[PDB]
Design an enzyme around this catalytic site. Structure first.
Site, mmCIF file in Angstrom:
data_model
loop_
_atom_site.group_PDB
_atom_site.id
_atom_site.type_symbol
_atom_site.label_atom_id
_atom_site.label_comp_id
_atom_site.label_asym_id
_atom_site.label_seq_id
_atom_site.Cartn_x
_atom_site.Cartn_y
_atom_site.Cartn_z
ATOM 1 N N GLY A 259 0.469 -1.181 -0.202
ATOM 2 C CA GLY A 259 0.281 0.132 -0.247
ATOM 3 C C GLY A 259 0.928 1.338 0.083
ATOM 4 N NE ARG B 217 -10.123 4.433 11.446
ATOM 5 C CZ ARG B 217 -8.288 4.711 11.669
ATOM 6 N NH1 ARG B 217 -8.237 4.612 12.640
ATOM 7 N NH2 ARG B 217 -7.489 5.698 10.816
ATOM 8 C CB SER C 285 -12.337 4.489 16.922
ATOM 9 O OG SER C 285 -11.992 4.693 15.860
ATOM 10 N NE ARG D 46 3.539 -6.569 11.186
ATOM 11 C CZ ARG D 46 4.896 -6.816 10.540
ATOM 12 N NH1 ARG D 46 5.250 -8.040 11.182
ATOM 13 N NH2 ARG D 46 5.592 -6.163 9.097
ATOM 14 C CB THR E 241 -1.934 -10.985 -6.069
ATOM 15 O OG1 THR E 241 -2.708 -11.993 -6.291
ATOM 16 C CG2 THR E 241 -1.602 -10.929 -7.670
ATOM 17 C CE1 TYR F 103 22.716 -21.582 -34.680
ATOM 18 C CE2 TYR F 103 24.857 -21.041 -34.398
ATOM 19 C CZ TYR F 103 23.988 -22.011 -34.168
ATOM 20 O OH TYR F 103 24.078 -23.046 -32.708
ATOM 21 C CB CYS G 272 23.287 -25.841 -31.268
ATOM 22 S SG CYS G 272 25.025 -26.558 -30.528
ATOM 23 C CD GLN H 76 18.990 -25.380 -27.768
ATOM 24 O OE1 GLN H 76 20.299 -25.082 -27.216
ATOM 25 N NE2 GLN H 76 18.308 -25.174 -26.544
ATOM 26 N NE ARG H 77 24.363 -29.869 -33.332
ATOM 27 C CZ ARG H 77 25.915 -30.356 -32.653
ATOM 28 N NH1 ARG H 77 26.087 -30.647 -31.531
ATOM 29 N NH2 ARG H 77 26.327 -28.990 -33.207
ATOM 30 C CG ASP I 236 25.770 -25.605 -21.824
ATOM 31 O OD1 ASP I 236 26.805 -24.608 -21.174
ATOM 32 O OD2 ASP I 236 25.501 -25.524 -20.420
ATOM 33 C CE1 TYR J 216 30.328 -29.073 -22.016
ATOM 34 C CE2 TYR J 216 28.535 -27.779 -22.394
ATOM 35 C CZ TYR J 216 29.611 -28.750 -22.925
ATOM 36 O OH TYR J 216 28.959 -28.714 -23.888
HETATM 37 N N1 LIG Z 1 -2.097 -5.045 -0.724
HETATM 38 C C1 LIG Z 1 -3.368 -5.356 -0.276
HETATM 39 O O1 LIG Z 1 -3.300 -6.962 -0.378
HETATM 40 C C2 LIG Z 1 -4.222 -4.681 0.439
HETATM 41 C C3 LIG Z 1 -3.353 -3.716 1.734
HETATM 42 N N2 LIG Z 1 -3.658 -2.803 1.821
HETATM 43 C C4 LIG Z 1 -3.353 -1.604 2.183
HETATM 44 O O2 LIG Z 1 -2.863 -1.091 3.697
HETATM 45 C C5 LIG Z 1 -3.325 -0.119 4.377
HETATM 46 C C6 LIG Z 1 -3.846 -0.234 5.789
HETATM 47 O O3 LIG Z 1 -3.138 -0.702 6.939
HETATM 48 P P1 LIG Z 1 -3.340 -0.269 8.252
HETATM 49 O O4 LIG Z 1 -2.117 1.077 7.958
HETATM 50 O O5 LIG Z 1 -2.005 -1.169 9.014
HETATM 51 O O6 LIG Z 1 -4.553 -0.223 8.896
HETATM 52 P P2 LIG Z 1 -5.169 -1.218 9.017
HETATM 53 O O7 LIG Z 1 -6.221 -1.378 7.546
HETATM 54 O O8 LIG Z 1 -4.300 -2.181 9.285
HETATM 55 O O9 LIG Z 1 -6.488 -0.363 10.333
HETATM 56 C C7 LIG Z 1 -5.858 -0.162 11.638
HETATM 57 C C8 LIG Z 1 -6.814 0.062 12.432
HETATM 58 O O10 LIG Z 1 -7.139 -1.420 12.594
HETATM 59 C C9 LIG Z 1 -7.377 -0.904 13.991
HETATM 60 N N3 LIG Z 1 -6.532 -1.890 15.166
HETATM 61 C C10 LIG Z 1 -6.068 -2.312 13.695
HETATM 62 N N4 LIG Z 1 -4.992 -3.108 15.046
HETATM 63 C C11 LIG Z 1 -5.918 -3.028 16.596
HETATM 64 C C12 LIG Z 1 -5.775 -4.599 17.750
HETATM 65 N N5 LIG Z 1 -5.640 -4.885 18.091
HETATM 66 N N6 LIG Z 1 -6.390 -3.969 18.654
HETATM 67 C C13 LIG Z 1 -7.747 -2.621 18.692
HETATM 68 N N7 LIG Z 1 -7.946 -1.996 17.162
HETATM 69 C C14 LIG Z 1 -6.724 -2.067 16.068
HETATM 70 C C15 LIG Z 1 -7.024 0.701 14.663
HETATM 71 O O11 LIG Z 1 -8.502 1.175 14.752
HETATM 72 P P3 LIG Z 1 -8.693 1.862 15.461
HETATM 73 O O12 LIG Z 1 -7.794 3.465 14.995
HETATM 74 O O13 LIG Z 1 -10.108 2.930 14.852
HETATM 75 O O14 LIG Z 1 -9.115 1.404 16.576
HETATM 76 C C16 LIG Z 1 -6.308 0.270 13.092
HETATM 77 O O15 LIG Z 1 -5.824 1.794 13.609
HETATM 78 C C17 LIG Z 1 -3.319 0.814 3.417
HETATM 79 O O16 LIG Z 1 -2.700 1.886 2.990
HETATM 80 C C18 LIG Z 1 -3.961 -0.064 2.254
HETATM 81 O O17 LIG Z 1 -4.082 0.261 1.284
HETATM 82 C C19 LIG Z 1 -4.796 -3.108 3.032
HETATM 83 C C20 LIG Z 1 -5.541 -4.193 2.633
HETATM 84 C C21 LIG Z 1 -4.953 -4.553 1.671
HETATM 85 C C1 LIG Z 2 23.346 -20.485 -26.789
HETATM 86 C C2 LIG Z 2 24.015 -19.853 -26.402
HETATM 87 C C3 LIG Z 2 25.183 -18.556 -27.236
HETATM 88 N N1 LIG Z 2 26.275 -18.835 -26.559
HETATM 89 C C4 LIG Z 2 26.963 -19.391 -27.501
HETATM 90 C C5 LIG Z 2 28.146 -20.512 -26.844
HETATM 91 C C6 LIG Z 2 29.073 -20.994 -27.831
HETATM 92 C C7 LIG Z 2 29.646 -22.131 -27.195
HETATM 93 C C8 LIG Z 2 29.415 -22.412 -26.206
HETATM 94 N N2 LIG Z 2 29.541 -24.113 -25.587
HETATM 95 C C9 LIG Z 2 29.168 -24.116 -24.451
HETATM 96 N N3 LIG Z 2 29.870 -25.533 -23.674
HETATM 97 N N4 LIG Z 2 28.836 -23.808 -24.026
HETATM 98 C C10 LIG Z 2 27.866 -22.825 -24.594
HETATM 99 O O1 LIG Z 2 26.808 -22.458 -23.903
HETATM 100 C C11 LIG Z 2 28.294 -22.364 -25.383
HETATM 101 C C12 LIG Z 2 27.625 -21.292 -26.195
HETATM 102 C C13 LIG Z 2 26.651 -18.294 -25.754
HETATM 103 C C14 LIG Z 2 27.926 -18.301 -25.400
HETATM 104 C C15 LIG Z 2 28.397 -17.796 -23.521
HETATM 105 C C16 LIG Z 2 27.237 -17.483 -22.532
HETATM 106 C C17 LIG Z 2 28.146 -17.711 -21.801
HETATM 107 O O2 LIG Z 2 29.078 -17.275 -20.885
HETATM 108 N N5 LIG Z 2 27.260 -16.217 -20.838
HETATM 109 C C18 LIG Z 2 26.854 -15.857 -19.477
HETATM 110 C C19 LIG Z 2 29.064 -15.421 -19.180
HETATM 111 C C20 LIG Z 2 28.712 -13.798 -20.688
HETATM 112 C C21 LIG Z 2 28.247 -12.626 -19.705
HETATM 113 O O3 LIG Z 2 28.474 -12.221 -18.581
HETATM 114 O O4 LIG Z 2 27.363 -12.172 -21.050
HETATM 115 C C22 LIG Z 2 26.653 -16.219 -17.912
HETATM 116 O O5 LIG Z 2 26.866 -16.216 -18.181
HETATM 117 O O6 LIG Z 2 25.742 -16.659 -18.283
HETATM 118 C C23 LIG Z 2 26.246 -17.883 -23.231
HETATM 119 C C24 LIG Z 2 25.854 -17.779 -24.464
HETATM 120 N N1 LIG Z 3 -4.644 -9.887 -3.682
HETATM 121 C C1 LIG Z 3 -5.644 -8.723 -3.130
HETATM 122 N N2 LIG Z 3 -5.779 -7.494 -3.224
HETATM 123 C C2 LIG Z 3 -6.045 -6.963 -3.458
HETATM 124 O O1 LIG Z 3 -5.666 -5.455 -4.314
HETATM 125 C C3 LIG Z 3 -6.445 -6.446 -2.363
HETATM 126 C C4 LIG Z 3 -6.454 -7.421 -1.922
HETATM 127 N N3 LIG Z 3 -5.789 -8.829 -1.775
HETATM 128 N N4 LIG Z 3 -6.980 -7.068 0.081
HETATM 129 C C5 LIG Z 3 -7.764 -7.004 0.445
HETATM 130 C C6 LIG Z 3 -7.211 -5.610 -0.612
HETATM 131 C C7 LIG Z 3 -8.309 -4.057 0.494
HETATM 132 N N5 LIG Z 3 -8.209 -3.739 -0.323
HETATM 133 C C8 LIG Z 3 -9.601 -3.440 -1.540
HETATM 134 C C9 LIG Z 3 -9.565 -3.015 -2.329
HETATM 135 C C10 LIG Z 3 -11.656 -3.194 -3.238
HETATM 136 C C11 LIG Z 3 -12.099 -3.916 -2.825
HETATM 137 C C12 LIG Z 3 -12.929 -4.294 -4.272
HETATM 138 O O2 LIG Z 3 -14.104 -3.179 -3.744
HETATM 139 N N6 LIG Z 3 -13.248 -5.981 -3.851
HETATM 140 C C13 LIG Z 3 -14.464 -6.203 -4.921
HETATM 141 C C14 LIG Z 3 -13.702 -5.806 -6.131
HETATM 142 C C15 LIG Z 3 -14.983 -6.099 -6.818
HETATM 143 C C16 LIG Z 3 -14.296 -6.395 -8.364
HETATM 144 O O3 LIG Z 3 -13.394 -5.675 -8.832
HETATM 145 O O4 LIG Z 3 -14.877 -7.530 -10.049
HETATM 146 C C17 LIG Z 3 -14.577 -7.029 -4.492
HETATM 147 O O5 LIG Z 3 -16.127 -7.682 -5.220
HETATM 148 O O6 LIG Z 3 -14.253 -7.636 -3.622
HETATM 149 C C18 LIG Z 3 -11.432 -4.784 -2.456
HETATM 150 C C19 LIG Z 3 -10.207 -4.493 -1.345
HETATM 151 N N7 LIG Z 3 -6.773 -5.150 -1.543
#
Ligand SMILES: NC(=O)C1=CN([C@@H]2O[C@H](COP(=O)(O)OP(=O)(O)OC[C@H]3O[C@@H](n4cnc5c(N)ncnc54)[C@H](OP(=O)(O)O)[C@@H]3O)[C@@H](O)[C@H]2O)C=CC1
Ligand SMILES: C#CCN(Cc1ccc2[nH]c(N)nc(=O)c2c1)c1ccc(C(=O)N[C@H](CCC(=O)O)C(=O)O)cc1
Ligand SMILES: Nc1nc(=O)c2c([nH]1)NCC(CNc1ccc(C(=O)N[C@@H](CCC(=O)O)C(=O)O)cc1)=N2
Ligand SMILES: NC(=O)C1=CN([C@@H]2O[C@H](COP(=O)(O)OP(=O)(O)OC[C@H]3O[C@@H](n4cnc5c(N)ncnc54)[C@H](OP(=O)(O)O)[C@@H]3O)[C@@H](O)[C@H]2O)C=CC1
Ligand SMILES: C#CCN(Cc1ccc2[nH]c(N)nc(=O)c2c1)c1ccc(C(=O)N[C@@H](CCC(=O)O)C(=O)O)cc1
Ligand SMILES: Nc1nc(=O)c2c([nH]1)NCC(CNc1ccc(C(=O)N[C@@H](CCC(=O)O)C(=O)O)cc1)=N2
Ligand SMILES: O=c1ccn([C@H]2C[C@H](O)[C@@H](COP(=O)(O)O)O2)c(=O)[nH]1
Ligand SMILES: O=c1ccn([C@H]2C[C@H](O)[C@@H](COP(=O)(O)O)O2)c(=O)[nH]1
Lengths: 508, 507
Positions: B18, B54, B76, B118, B132, B328, B388, B408-409, B412, B452
């Site tokens: 986030g 929240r 709250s 957490r 994701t 080639y 090759c 590839q015949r 490596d 190799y």
């Molecule tokens: N990428 C994703 O999948 C998701 C991302 N997010 C992102 O995460 C961020 C939100 O995370 P975060 O900042 O942690 O906020 P949260 O959504 O985790 O919510 C925190 C709030 O929840 C309540 N709460 C949390 N822990 C406690 C506890 N132990 N006891 C009582 N109340 C608690 C408190 O509310 P109060 O102050 O009212 O007590 C606190 O202010 C957003 O930026 C959002 O965009 C969120 C969901 C999914």
């Molecule tokens: C297939 C193919 C093309 N080729 C031509 C080529 C020619 C003779 C070969 N001979 C053998 N035995 N193996 C090969 O992979 C090979 C490859 C390659 C040649 C070198 C590297 C190589 O050493 N690549 C880096 C190192 C060099 C760099 O830092 O850029 C690496 O560490 O991965 C890759 C491909």
């Molecule tokens: N994997 C993942 N990605 C997120 O973005 C994500 C998550 N999980 N978990 C919680 C979260 C918190 N934010 C959000 C934001 C929007 C929706 C929401 O509108 N969901 C609708 C989407 C419908 C749609 O886009 O098709 C829902 O129907 O659930 C849910 C969570 N976001």
């Protein structure tokens, strides 16, 4: 509650299991199997029980089987404890009750005799079935295994194995019974959101109405399923498309198939494949011959269509003779880059002989990573009746002295072409192996445009309804010195019991 | 007892979730996910409950989410009774209590806030984590998702997806605790036949060399296509010597798939230098075989096989240094052309496959003959090295994407493979742009897949890191001729790799 499963080995077609009080064949591995699965248990303090008819008891030589407790069903025999590891019962019904008692018995097995099998089944006593299919068919049986009741479904089919040139097969059947989501659900939802933007939706798993032997979910080991499942995959995902022939297909791009050649020969069983024509087209290639008449002369017509006057005229080769296919597969193999005149000319020494080099390289430098054979010549494509479909192949010698083959195939007609291609490159690898002093290895085919022509749809549906049988075996009657010496008569196909041929028109 | 899962979207590297009370990016699909996952239930008479802080309640507009019951944790906020579909509690513990009744409430989700996530974790409240990963870093964040506990192990990782040029994917983490019928038969049958049963020649890798073992049925991230071929040879690779001095571990006949619609397959488990890749590609495209031109731009990948000591060794010391021969590039533009030296003018000599290719993809797209090859038996002797990555096929879907297949015949895995993948992902994108198509799929079929011996410790180092979302690769302008592409024309977006891993090439 304890498990009771049958264990048996019967002929693939008629299910014969015996003759004159004996097994109709001798296969160590199978007995070693019977032993392994029969002693299988996890409680040291317990033992398994093996039920069997009296006559089978006579065949076993009336000696006990180590670590097990035989159980004979007989009208007339003593119930003495001369041997603690052998008991007798008057009927099979009663013979059961190893469950009721004997917390010392973990599992039960019906080692049969026809009469005993036919009753264990009839009375719903059996749960599972371990079946060994043997490709030994044409031969006297007096004892057969009962037809499996429809309450059973196959769940496993092993690859084919070989012993004394006999092919065979381990299957498991089970009875049907009543009545983590997180991943499947997530993937499904992710699928709803993205549609075909999620690759998985572009490769949807085949629906069961087009899945072969659906019941076998985790036990698809028969490498014939490598071909049947590709068929399913395109029937399910194949995009409809037009092509030069005027007969549309359903096509997906980039598939694969592996086949073992160590224990068997990959000649499809789900339909009769005509192997007289595959070998004949093969030496025809091997000899570098491009004259399609030589093929027609041996009553092999697979190249007539792309050899006719009209088609040749249609594709701009109207000058050619009725079957001069141009510098196609054979020519490229033996004379890569040869300047082609007609099929009547002598090309001795012209062009690069890749096959010859392949062989000299496989022998001298086996671990060389350049064992390549190509038919794709940009300079000659226009002179070919058809540009090469199976485009280049790579060959690879294992440390244990087998010869494996890889083949990329740009265009593959799954119904007509593929079966032929599989058998062909398998035969070619074998020939190559004998000539270079190796054993057959593995076969892997990589496909570009995998398709099924739309006038093959009902026929392939038919084939997909047939459960695969064990692959046959293929052997050479003599060791030849030159690869171009093989003859049809030199070939011996052992134990091939395909389903019936299925007519399929080729698209010119 | 009822299920409690977390749902969050954080940045790939720093876990930023986030900024100033709102999300730090706008990804429609991700919200659709959140909506679908949190709405997913078995019983129609019940509903799911979404717990949030929240501040999240604030950022959400403070309006209810259709079909679900929101639970706000606040010290709250006034515990009124007004909206039936929204409730407030004074602390996390108490809200649980969803678990104990409302049998109306089928499943539970912690939709977080840095403080709420957490706490759900610190108190052993969550069973699962839907995460994701967004490939956006180098932007402010004032909120973060906590670090995943060790009691959690990944079980799924989707492919990389793209929205507004932003790479992202989906993961699932499970928590830990404490029919053999078919498997038993196979084991026994393995005992009996040994190396005769093909399955024994293709053993499943031991988990000590399997990348991110916990993901058994969910390795959808196609970084796994490469990583797994790696461990597959590590498990079955036969030790064998080779032209070079360095032995190799290898298996024969493998394949890898890569989607190019939503992402560019540039390996993340190790920093890949795509620039050398690009420069080698246009070099090929131009039909150039001059190793100098490459060294010119600080690209040395071909110097090894361009040295006089090497040209001498293979019987080519007759030519200038770095004159690699009809390799080639020469075969692509000038197949079957008669090579002389890297300087002569080959305009018009040989068959121009690359040209034909573009013309065919444009004029006849459904054609099953879009092939490009480099294997020319007649030229193999003049090449500093035989091709090759040997031949490719190109494919126009009905929905106007361009797919590519490569064989590839020799490959490596540690050094070449990563390069080949990127190289061809690019070439296909270029062709597609030039032919007016969208990128499709990439499949690589391999002959001799090997590692190799002097790469073992490095590749195990690579296999130790969990893969990150693939980046995106965009072209800055539309070009006239495919050979007009320039390095600045390329834009790599969202590439966050693990540290580079030094590996020596076997000359
Ligand atoms: N990428 C994703 O999948 C998701 C991302 N997010 C992102 O995460 C961020 C939100 O995370 P975060 O900042 O942690 O906020 P949260 O959504 O985790 O919510 C925190 C709030 O929840 C309540 N709460 C949390 N822990 C406690 C506890 N132990 N006891 C009582 N109340 C608690 C408190 O509310 P109060 O102050 O009212 O007590 C606190 O202010 C957003 O930026 C959002 O965009 C969120 C969901 C999914
Ligand atoms: C297939 C193919 C093309 N080729 C031509 C080529 C020619 C003779 C070969 N001979 C053998 N035995 N193996 C090969 O992979 C090979 C490859 C390659 C040649 C070198 C590297 C190589 O050493 N690549 C880096 C190192 C060099 C760099 O830092 O850029 C690496 O560490 O991965 C890759 C491909
Ligand atoms: N994997 C993942 N990605 C997120 O973005 C994500 C998550 N999980 N978990 C919680 C979260 C918190 N934010 C959000 C934001 C929007 C929706 C929401 O509108 N969901 C609708 C989407 C419908 C749609 O886009 O098709 C829902 O129907 O659930 C849910 C969570 N976001
Ligand atoms: N391939 C394979 O997997 C196997 C093949 N076989 C073969 O099968 C053949 C034996 O089959 P099969 O001819 O059926 O001989 P069985 O082994 O079935 O023995 C039948 C005998 O069991 C006793 N019995 C059978 N039914 C009853 C009953 N209802 N009540 C009481 N006793 C009964 C009778 O003996 P009694 O007259 O003494 O009462 C009967 O003669 C052999 O050729 C053997 O080689 C055997 C096992 C496995
Ligand atoms: C691959 C390949 C070789 N080839 C060469 C070949 C040439 C052009 C092609 N064209 C098309 N569109 N598909 C093909 O499979 C095909 C195959 C084959 C040609 C025909 C048959 C075919 O019709 N086979 C019948 C067999 C009839 C018989 O043998 O009596 C069959 O039922 O299988 C098989 C293979
Ligand atoms: N699958 C199967 N194959 C069979 O041949 C077979 C069967 N099931 N069920 C019953 C049966 C009846 N004939 C026989 C003949 C020999 C043994 C036998 O020798 N068993 C020993 C073999 C030891 C070994 O070969 O390793 C054992 O230890 O099990 C068993 C049954 N034969
Ligand atoms: O060895 C072969 C001969 C060709 N075909 C099939 C592929 C296509 O169905 C047709 C060739 O047509 P194009 O792909 O060239 O259009 O024949 C095969 O499957 N294998
Ligand atoms: O595009 C390339 C260039 C070559 N190499 C590697 C493969 C081998 O490790 C070595 C070539 O070995 P040979 O098979 O040519 O002997 O270079 C690649 O992996 N990909």
């Amino acid at each position: 509650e304890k498990n009771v499963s049958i264990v048996v080995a019967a002929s693939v077609l008629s299910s014969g299991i015996g003759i004159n009080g004996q097994l109709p064949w001798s296969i160590s591995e199978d007995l070693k199997f019977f032993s392994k699965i029969t002693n299988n248990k996890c409680d040291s303090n317990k033992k398994n029980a093996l039920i069997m008819g009296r006559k089978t008891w006579d065949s076993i030589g009336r000696r006990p089987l180590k670590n097990r407790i035989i159980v004979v069903i007989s009208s007339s025999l003593p119930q003495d404890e001369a041997d603690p590891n052998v008991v007798v019962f008057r009927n099979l019904e009663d013979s059961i009750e190893n469950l009721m008692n004997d917390d010392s018995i973990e599992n039960i097995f019906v080692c049969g005799g026809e009469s005993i099998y036919r009753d264990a089944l009839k009375d719903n006593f059996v749960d599972r079935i371990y079946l060994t299919r043997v490709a030994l068919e044409d031969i006297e049986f007096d004892t057969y295994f009962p037809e499996i009741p429809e309450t059973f479904l196959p769940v496993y089919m092993s690859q084919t194995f070989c012993t004394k040139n006999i092919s065979y097969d381990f299957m498991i059947f089970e009875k049907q019974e009543k009545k983590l989501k997180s991943i499947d659900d997530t993937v499904d939802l992710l699928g709803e959101i993205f549609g075909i933007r999620k690759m998985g939706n572009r490769h949807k798993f085949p629906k069961e109405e087009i899945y072969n032997t659906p019941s076998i979910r985790f036990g698809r080991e028969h490498y014939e399923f490598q071909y049947l499942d590709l068929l399913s995959r395109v029937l399910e995902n194949g995009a409809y498309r037009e092509n030069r022939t005027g007969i549309s297909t359903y096509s997906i791009f980039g598939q694969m198939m592996r086949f073992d050649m160590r224990e068997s020969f990959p000649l499809l069983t789900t339909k009769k494949v005509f192997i007289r024509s595959i070998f004949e087209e093969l030496i025809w290639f091997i000899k570098g011959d491009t004259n399609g008449n030589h093929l027609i002369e041996k009553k092999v017509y697979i190249w007539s269509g792309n050899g006719s006057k009209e088609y040749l005229e249609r594709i701009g080769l109207g000058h050619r003779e009725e079957n001069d296919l141009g510098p196609i597969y054979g020519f490229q193999w033996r004379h890569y880059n040869g300047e082609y005149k007609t099929m009547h000319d002598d090309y001795t020494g012209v062009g690069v002989d890749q096959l010859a080099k392949l062989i000299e390289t496989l022998k001298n430098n086996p671990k060389d990573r350049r064992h390549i054979l190509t038919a794709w010549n940009p300079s000659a494509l226009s002179q070919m009746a058809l540009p090469p479909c199976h485009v280049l192949s790579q060959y690879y010698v294992t440390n244990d002295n087998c010869l494996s083959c890889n083949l990329y195939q740009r265009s593959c007609d799954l119904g007509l072409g593929s079966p032929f291609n599989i058998a062909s490159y398998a035969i070619l690898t074998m020939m190559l192996a004998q000539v270079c002093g190796y054993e057959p290895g593995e076969l892997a085919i990589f496909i570009g445009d995998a398709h099924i022509y739309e006038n093959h749809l009902t026929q392939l549906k038919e084939q997909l309804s047939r459960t695969p049988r064990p692959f046959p075996q293929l052997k050479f009657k003599r060791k030849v010195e030159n690869i171009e010496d093989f003859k049809w008569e030199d070939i011996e196909l052992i134990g091939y019991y395909p389903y019936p041929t299925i007519k399929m028109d080729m698209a010119v």
